Amino acid sequence: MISLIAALAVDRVIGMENAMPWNLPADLAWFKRNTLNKPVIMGRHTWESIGRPLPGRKNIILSSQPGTDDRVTWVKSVDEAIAACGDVPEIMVIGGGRVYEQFLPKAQKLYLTHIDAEVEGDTHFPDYEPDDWESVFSEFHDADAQNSHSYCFEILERR
Ligand SMILES: NC(=O)c1ccc[n+]([C@@H]2O[C@H](COP(=O)([O-])OP(=O)(O)OC[C@H]3O[C@@H](n4cnc5c(N)ncnc54)[C@H](OP(=O)(O)O)[C@@H]3O)[C@@H](O)[C@H]2O)c1
Numbered sequence: 794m795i796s797l798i799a800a801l802a803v804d805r806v807i808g809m810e811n812a813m814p815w816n817l818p819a820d821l822a823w824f825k826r827n828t829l830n831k832p833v834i835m836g837r838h839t840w841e842s843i844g845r846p847l848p849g850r851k852n853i854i855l856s857s858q859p860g861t862d863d864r865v866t867w868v869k870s871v872d873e874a875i876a877a878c879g880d881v882p883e884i885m886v887i888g889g890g891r892v893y894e895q896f897l898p899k900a901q902k903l904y905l906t907h908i909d910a911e912v913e914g915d916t917h918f919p920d921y922e923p924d925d926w927e928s929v930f931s932e933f934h935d936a937d938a939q940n941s942h943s944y945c946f947e948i949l950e951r952r
């Protein structure tokens with residue numbers, strides 16, 4: 794099973810200048826809990842944005858060009874990325890925009906954080922047909938001293 798996990802600001806913005814400008818520790822904790830001990834697939838730009846391997850996960854990087862770091866697994870196509878995960882129950886695709894576009898048709902589950910923040914950005918999460926997805930979990934949180942915006946955790950499953 795393939796799942797996508799992302800955090801979206803207003804208008805589905807996910808990034809600006811290869812960075813995420815907000816800081817929501819609660820959302821990073823949610824990301825870690827839902828990805829630990831699973832393989833994660835990312836594109837090369839997101840790998841450079843993160844800057845280091847994510848511990849406790851098999852890190853698979855999509856790039857057309859040879860890898861430059863043997864701490865992670867480099868693959869050259871979607872089918873190769875899936876094969877490199879092996880026979881696991883759940884594969885997590887962690888972006889960015891181009892990678893999300895390619896895996897969305899193959900995904901059965903979306904883990905979305907909706908952040909109440911207006912961000913000028915240059916990368917967006919793909920348009921997804923709402924009729925195709927059922928919301929199976931949602932949890933709203935007001936802003937607090939650690940998290941400066943309100944946010945909504947949602948899990949959607951393909952109908
Ligand atoms: N808010 C969130 O949840 C979230 C999550 C992830 C990322 N982001 C943000 O998203 C932005 C990065 O997104 P992006 O769309 O620019 O880049 P991306 O999807 O991370 O990376 C695209 C790169 O991945 C490689 N790639 C993708 N598909 C491939 C394929 N089928 N075969 C081979 N290589 C492939 C190519 O690398 P080569 O040019 O090396 O071939 C391509 O240029 C940043 O702002 C980051 O902070 C946000």
Ligand SMILES: Nc1nc(=O)c2nc(CNc3ccc(C(=O)N[C@@H](CCC(=O)O)C(=O)O)cc3)cnc2[nH]1
Pocket residue numbers: 798799800813820821823824825839842843847848887888905906
């Ligand atoms: N829900 C969600 N929120 C995000 O911010 C997010 N970000 C990305 C891409 N960017 C990043 C950047 C840093 C780390 C990272 O360092 N994660 C640590 C958290 C510990 C910490 O730095 O506080 C990890 O171990 O997972 C992960 C993804 C992909 N999916 C996401 N999904």
Ligand SMILES: [Mn+2]
Pocket residue numbers: 870872
């Ligand atoms: Mn092929």
Ligand SMILES: [Mn+2]
Pocket residue numbers: 879880
């Ligand atoms: Mn198999």
Ligand SMILES: [Mn+2]
Pocket residue numbers: 801802805906907908
């Ligand atoms: Mn949203």
Ligand SMILES: [Mn+2]
Pocket residue numbers: 909910911941942943
């Ligand atoms: Mn806000």
